[PDB]
Amino acid sequence: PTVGIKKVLLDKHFGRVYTEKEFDELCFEYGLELDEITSEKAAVEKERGEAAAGEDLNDQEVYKIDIPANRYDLLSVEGLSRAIRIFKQEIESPEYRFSDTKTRQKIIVKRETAQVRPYVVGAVLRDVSFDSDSYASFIDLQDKLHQNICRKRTLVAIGTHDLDTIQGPFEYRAEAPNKIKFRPLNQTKEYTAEELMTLYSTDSHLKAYLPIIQNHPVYPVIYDKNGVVCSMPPIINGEHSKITLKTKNVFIEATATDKQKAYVVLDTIVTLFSQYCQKPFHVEQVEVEYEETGEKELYPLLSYREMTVTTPEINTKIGLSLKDEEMAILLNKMSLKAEVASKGVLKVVVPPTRHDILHACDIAEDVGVAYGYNNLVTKLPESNTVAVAFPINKLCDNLRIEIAAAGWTEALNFALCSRDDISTKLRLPDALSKAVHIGNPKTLEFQVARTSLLPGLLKTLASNRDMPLPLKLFELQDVILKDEKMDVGARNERRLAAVYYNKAAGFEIIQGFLDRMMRMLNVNPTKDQKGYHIEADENPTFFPGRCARIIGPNGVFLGRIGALHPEVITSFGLTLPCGAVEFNVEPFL
Amino acid sequence: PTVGIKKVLLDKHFGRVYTEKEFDELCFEYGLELDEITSEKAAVEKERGEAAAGEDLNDQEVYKIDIPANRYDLLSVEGLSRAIRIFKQEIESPEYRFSDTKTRQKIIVKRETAQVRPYVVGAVLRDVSFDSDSYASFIDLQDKLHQNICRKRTLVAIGTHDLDTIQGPFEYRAEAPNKIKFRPLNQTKEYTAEELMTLYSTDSHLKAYLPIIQNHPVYPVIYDKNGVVCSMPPIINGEHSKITLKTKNVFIEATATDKQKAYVVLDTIVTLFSQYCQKPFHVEQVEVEYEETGEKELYPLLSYREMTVTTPEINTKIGLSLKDEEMAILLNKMSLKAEVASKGVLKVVVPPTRHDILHACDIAEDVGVAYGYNNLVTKLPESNTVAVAFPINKLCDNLRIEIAAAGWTEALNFALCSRDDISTKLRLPDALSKAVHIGNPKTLEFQVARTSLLPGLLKTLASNRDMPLPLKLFELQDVILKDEKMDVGARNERRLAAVYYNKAAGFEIIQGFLDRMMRMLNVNPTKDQKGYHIEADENPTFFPGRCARIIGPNGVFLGRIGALHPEVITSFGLTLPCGAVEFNVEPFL
Amino acid sequence: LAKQEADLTPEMIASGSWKEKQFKKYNFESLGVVPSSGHLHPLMKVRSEFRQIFFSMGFSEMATNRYVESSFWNFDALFQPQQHPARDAHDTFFVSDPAISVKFPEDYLERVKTVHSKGGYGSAGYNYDWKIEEAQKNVLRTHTTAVSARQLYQLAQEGFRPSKLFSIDRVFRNETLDATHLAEFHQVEGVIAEKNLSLAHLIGIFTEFFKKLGITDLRFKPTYNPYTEPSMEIFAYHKGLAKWVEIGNSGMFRPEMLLPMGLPADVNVAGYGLSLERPTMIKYGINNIRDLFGSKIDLEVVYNNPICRLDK
Amino acid sequence: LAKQEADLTPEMIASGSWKEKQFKKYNFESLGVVPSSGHLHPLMKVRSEFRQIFFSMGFSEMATNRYVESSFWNFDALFQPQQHPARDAHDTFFVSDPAISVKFPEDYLERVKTVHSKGGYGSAGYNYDWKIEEAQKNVLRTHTTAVSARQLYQLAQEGFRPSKLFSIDRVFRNETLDATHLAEFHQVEGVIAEKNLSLAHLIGIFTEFFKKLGITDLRFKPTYNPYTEPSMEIFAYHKGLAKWVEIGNSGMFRPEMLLPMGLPADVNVAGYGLSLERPTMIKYGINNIRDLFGSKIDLEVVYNNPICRLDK
Ligand SMILES: [Mg+2]
Ligand SMILES: [Mg+2]
């Protein structure tokens, strides 16, 4: 539910002026939420659209506050301010009692009423002191209750009357539609039930409530002693019993088919507005007797419910170590009167304003809210339950899936090779100065460890030369390089290499592969030190005029790309042009 | 190490004839492995190749048995049979002692020998009873020891001589190469050291042992009292001291640079062949004194090593609940004499035949082998530590990766649709009899739940109609069908659907997609009830003459494939031919 | 110009004529030919990443191919009274054909009816008349908690053992045509059941889960949920707007929907959950959700979609 | 024939002229056009499946990009004496340039030297003269246990906590040109370290691991391994040859290579391992390994490769 409250009214009830930030923090602490701030002038101005501007109402701000769906006492400023001020330990929690009265009102229920609306309850508020704001709040509370818990007035209906304008023991009849006739509220001439239905058929506000009892053979009605129709629930009240600002006594009644929700609604209404009485927090009872059964009941109930919880269970469920007295004091901040009986056992008394406490777990949530959910010491799971991957392997796997999606076949080669493959066939005479040499090979093929992935791809192309063109192989693996700063003098660098073998091996075909690989790594082609680019370069292993150097983010050299030299092609047995690319993938980590 | 043993010799030593299966099971129980079976006739026949057939040797079978690398007493039939028979509780474990002798042999070590081969040990076997087989076994044991633990004779070298053909206190000199001259084994005339090196330079068997001491300024040599060169280790022995079948006393010596391996080799040799003595398991000691230091030692050691283990540690490491006496009896089967001292503490005595027991864990492995590794009660991990996936989701993910690799784009649509989409636009008037209907929709779009995935793909094609051709979208998701046998009356079926939209939408293009999808699921296109096939069919939603029904394994209907009807195309706003396929993927699970 | 082809012909490679003719200068400021590739869906990639995270933390997947569900498992089994705004027909789809389901476990249904209409197990109930005809109706599921209830009942029947489960699937809610929300959305949920479970353990579990998502500092706010008590809502700081934003929720199920199943009194079942579209929209920078889900999807977003480096 | 095209032209769809002309009969016994697709490598697929299994069981990956390794970590740290056939130069590659590594943790190296040359911690040692110049040399690693030793030492230095680790990478062995084996092969290994670990726990762990591979019944045979004691070898029944076949191995590390690191006396470290080529060859039906690994790979095998349904 959403409640709109004037800012000045909030200041009056709280007792101090809150800024927006303070009120937002207070809402975050308790569980509410400040939806919007809009002056009532602006609220009317933009309620139906900013074009329909209405500035005839108050210019004071109004806060829209969201209320938990199971909280009923927070539907008006009277209950909201009381709850918050008790939470901050400003005021003492009120106590609700019954006022002694030698003359009680009486309601007599007829048998036929068992056909449509069989249940009715009532209460009386005495010596009221309503003013301009309290009356509007009183109407708004009834509107909210009818819209949320009463289920659009289908289950429970509420009526309020002036106790002085009517007199006598009330009767709850179910006469025929043609047997009832009276003057409706805000109407001049009298009408009967059928005339009333015809009149309200074309209405808008009361249109939806008609089908509730429209088809029943009889209609509910309430009469006083002197044959005056007090109300015809759940449609409208009587004009003769209208309540205004001059009223000093209010009679509240509820007609329902569900007995429990009537209790809840009556208790909420009678507790929220019992402070305005000349004797604060005091109500007098009403007796209701059923003619069919002859039983008698008294209302309202004002039920204080006693529960018995155990401290160890609460601590285990929440994850705390609070003692008995600490938990009792903590619960005392949530409108609950908690008392310690013995060790580990706690007796709690829930007041009538809290009708959402069914099990002990509700009390546990109360003790967790009072303590604060941000003061709980967490306990992480053990290390041998969570599995952490090696980041470069995860990135390589995800990238390899996309490489396969692009249409490139994966290959696999040996780590060891000969000196001629990485030095002479690649036209790099100095390449041997960076490689790792093997002392005791058993063949003339395992002399050095590879420094580039190109020879493996070229030899694999040579083996499968007879397959239909084009051949598009790739491989991302480690290479071994000599580094003096390392512990052992060498290190492994993860590199991705790819080739494109066909009768035409234009630079564009492999440049597009490079661009797609960069796109999948979320790096844009920009020259502003945040993206990658390429520029001309000279290298013996690439054909002149078709070699480029790849510069990544922060001006970091990444690798090379271009068409291979004809001598490099012929040194591996191939006979067709091939494009190649190879670059490091560790900077992207 | 691999040991070849005659089958008849195995029968003689074990005491009973084992079949191949019984011997293989016995090897599997203890840890050995029967590599191959080949008669010595056939062994010579196919040793250098079946062309070089040699049938001049014994026709009896020979077993090739693999021995653990850390087991030294299992290198000959004498130790292997003893160990196995003790394991099966046939014979009692032997005890090794020293034989009293009033006259001990003596070796005097010269100072210069500290330059090349500074260590020497020795022992004497008395009253030997060698026969044809024991002599060959004796030679083979020395060959194996020189090939495995002695490191190709680089560290330790073994020599055997006849004790009667030579006499006097032996001396270990390091004279100059030109100062030594004698007659080599299997030679007629005498030679000096330089002449010997020149003669054996072109040899094959003794060629590799020359560089051991070739470059040293002096050569080791052993002399008797009467200036006779007994041997020149580690090259060859002396002809005058050759040992044959008529010998009754053997003198064994070991020259080494590593002192521990000499102990191990001497103990192994002296324990394996001490049964053939006239007094079984009895050896006499030899004294060795170093002239440079003046210290004296006695050999061999025959070291019994005492260890102290704790039962709870063994039980925890293995995972058993054995008592003290049970563990002692179990260890008694592994040639180890175990005795209980107090509760939880066990005293073990390792014999000289076991030189691989360094830590208590070796004893633990012994107690685990004696008990048996197949009699251990396993303890599975807890259920909340192992994560099990839902099989259809895993299959769908793996298949979707390949679908992406094929070049098809994934889409996503809503589960709810209108009646017109699945009934009238698809030219299926009766399709509404199988769908699920929704009672209270807020719009004319959520009337029924979808029964086919085609409308979603067609509408997605309609939205993106302006993108360049061809468009190849796919989707594998659930559809809702009405089924009376279910708990609630409806069920979800996982289906894969795909479309191909272009100016030409031949049946072949989508048939190839179907074939590739079948290939990735490992189902061949065969008509023999184990593969899939297609056959002609008639369906309103597919164009006549271009519709087919898919039959999977075991004659199970899977789905449909073909070109869509022009009316179905026009009912979704499309204007170009489209091919489609849709089939269930639950049978493949 | 000269014979300045962009490439060398195979004849030139064979005959070695590449050193006598010039070649054309190449513009290195341009871009190459875009390869024709197959693409995945961003929501599916995020779902796969979530599945991998759940597997790495030790959670077993559940079966969620049960779109149509009876009102007994969807509402009544979760202790939602029949006459409350939670079970309204305004936001729930109702199935007309087929309309009812008849076969239920009789003993469990009787216990559920007893706890709803009279109370028990240390509870008070609602003392209203529970009607079987209301539970007979079939609806499209509004949340995945029904599958969790089924799994918990099955586990309780065949003996209890600690368990960790998760589910990621579609749920349906009845909404009018607008832009704030759609009628269907994917909901990610994880459930942990074991003995003497506490709220601190749950806090640690989802703290680790979100740390694998690249989120470090978290705050908690009380909230209300019909079938969980205590319940809370998780907030994380956002620098793009410089404010705290809600990211997910959690809570522990009520004893009134566990004891009738048959679970031991010492077992606490906790759970947490979130959506799937919000993290995807934040990560990939997507404003309108309809450009990603439905028949109005924009394929250019799908084509130019990077890999899911959610830890970045 | 007639206008019997295999397809309808867009003009026919627009004008509705498809109902006046015949169409050509289609041969349903043939096959369609093979799409041009990208492919993965079968060994890589098997590796990914193994990684997923290890993650699902709760194992953390280690760093194994350390092909070149000093002889100290490869041999000496694992308690392999310098004068034994294990450390032979006949089956181990040796690096000549660079030849030596100089920087080692001095205290740990001193303890290793003491245990090798004199013994201790309830052991006997080999009482031989340990030489630093032998440990200086660099070799290509012959197994992945060196990385495990590094990780265990690092864990012991910074305080102990139970751990589960795994590694899948290449190892090198010096072999002549033949067909039985290659010089390089991928080795899968898993290590479990915790307090009071027993052999039965290890048996259960790899029983579960192999049950996820489709293997149910197992048998055990004693074996020998230099750095593990007790050790065993795992056999499974094969119906293609109707015989028991070795499938992997396991064992628990010796205390003589753990106590010098600094691990507590109550911690037992176990491990198990296998290869990668043998299960792949069995599953996909591959005879010659050189058709799958190296420069002689046959691409037709790669193209027609199904997905890895290893549970099948
Ligand atoms: Mg509450
Ligand atoms: Mg042993």
Side-chain angles (χ1 to χ4, degrees), chain B residues 70-71 354 356-357 361-362 365-366, chain D residues 223-224 229 254:
Chain B
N70 78 127
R71 295 299 300 268
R354 302 297 299 272
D356 49 327
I357 308 297
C361 61
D362 304 325
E365 189 199 39
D366 285 3
Chain D
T223 182
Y224 166 75
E229 187 112 351
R254 304 182 58 98

Side-chain angles (χ1 to χ4, degrees), chain C:
Chain C
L1 288 175
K3 199 54 186 306
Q4 321 172 8
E5 298 180 5
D7 298 327
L8 325 94
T9 59
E11 161 270 348
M12 279 192 279
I13 297 182
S15 174
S17 301
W18 51 264
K19 58 176 64 65
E20 294 82 355
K21 49 196 63 177
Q22 298 81 0
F23 287 94
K24 184 186 307 305
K25 297 170 296 302
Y26 191 86
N27 186 304
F28 292 143
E29 293 83 1
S30 61
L31 293 183
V33 179
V34 188
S36 61
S37 314
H39 313 85
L40 245 49
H41 198 263
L43 244 49
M44 301 293 101
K45 296 182 179 178
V46 179
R47 193 174 73 95
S48 301
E49 238 65 26
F50 272 79
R51 275 167 42 89
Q52 289 183 1
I53 295 180
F54 274 115
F55 285 148
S56 63
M57 297 191 62
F59 287 77
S60 305
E61 195 169 2
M62 297 186 301
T64 56
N65 45 13
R66 287 183 169 274
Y67 291 171
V68 179
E69 189 71 20
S70 65
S71 298
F72 174 78
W73 291 108
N74 190 21
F75 295 113
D76 285 65
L78 309 185
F79 197 65
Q80 298 190 22
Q82 299 183 353
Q83 301 292 350
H84 263 204
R87 204 200 288 248
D88 288 341
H90 180 60
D91 62 81
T92 305
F93 284 103
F94 274 90
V95 185
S96 63
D97 180 66
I100 57 181
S101 56
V102 195
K103 34 187 63 176
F104 300 116
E106 284 72 16
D107 195 4
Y108 180 59
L109 187 140
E110 176 74 296
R111 288 190 297 261
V112 167
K113 168 180 182 301
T114 299
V115 77
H116 265 251
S117 66
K118 295 184 179 302
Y121 311 107
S123 176
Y126 302 98
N127 59 93
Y128 78 112
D129 203 0
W130 193 84
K131 315 300 291 299
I132 175 67
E133 302 84 14
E134 192 64 31
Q136 302 288 82
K137 299 180 181 179
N138 292 333
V139 302
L140 296 181
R141 59 171 179 186
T142 60
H143 51 191
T144 56
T145 316
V147 180
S148 175
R150 284 180 174 266
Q151 286 282 350
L152 260 52
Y153 174 69
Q154 179 180 350
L155 167 66
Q157 285 307 307
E158 62 184 15
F160 173 75
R161 57 177 184 176
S163 303
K164 298 180 178 180
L165 309 163
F166 78 97
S167 58
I168 303 176
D169 214 331
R170 305 186 179 190
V171 301
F172 305 87
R173 297 178 186 270
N174 196 340
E175 293 293 336
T176 329
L177 294 183
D178 68 323
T180 61
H181 305 279
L182 301 183
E184 323 171 16
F185 68 97
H186 302 70
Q187 176 178 345
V188 179
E189 180 172 341
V191 182
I192 294 93
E194 54 195 21
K195 182 184 306 302
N196 296 333
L197 190 60
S198 65
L199 190 52
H201 291 96
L202 173 63
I203 292 183
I205 292 290
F206 65 69
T207 300
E208 198 74 22
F209 178 83
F210 282 111
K211 188 183 66 177
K212 286 194 171 181
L213 292 176
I215 304 177
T216 303
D217 197 3
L218 305 175
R219 293 184 60 86
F220 310 132
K221 186 177 76 63
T223 182
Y224 166 75
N225 207 35
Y227 44 85
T228 45
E229 187 112 351
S231 178
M232 69 173 56
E233 201 170 16
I234 312 174
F235 288 88
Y237 191 87
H238 192 15
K239 303 179 179 181
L241 283 71
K243 56 185 302 181
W244 298 90
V245 183
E246 173 260 11
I247 197 58
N249 46 19
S250 61
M252 293 189 296
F253 297 94
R254 304 182 58 98
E256 294 147 315
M257 60 91 62
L258 293 180
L259 301 184
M261 288 181 178
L263 279 314
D266 321 335
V267 173
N268 291 335
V269 182
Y272 61 94
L274 65 150
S275 60
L276 194 70
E277 290 79 1
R278 183 128 57 95
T280 303
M281 291 169 57
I282 291 183
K283 203 71 58 180
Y284 288 92
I286 300 298
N287 307 273
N288 189 20
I289 184 181
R290 283 184 167 83
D291 291 330
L292 199 64
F293 192 10
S295 64
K296 288 296 178 298
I297 184 180
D298 187 11
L299 293 181
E300 289 183 345
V301 176
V302 181
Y303 286 3
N304 301 273
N305 195 84
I307 73 180
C308 182
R309 304 181 61 184
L310 79 185
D311 57 327
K312 173 67 63 178

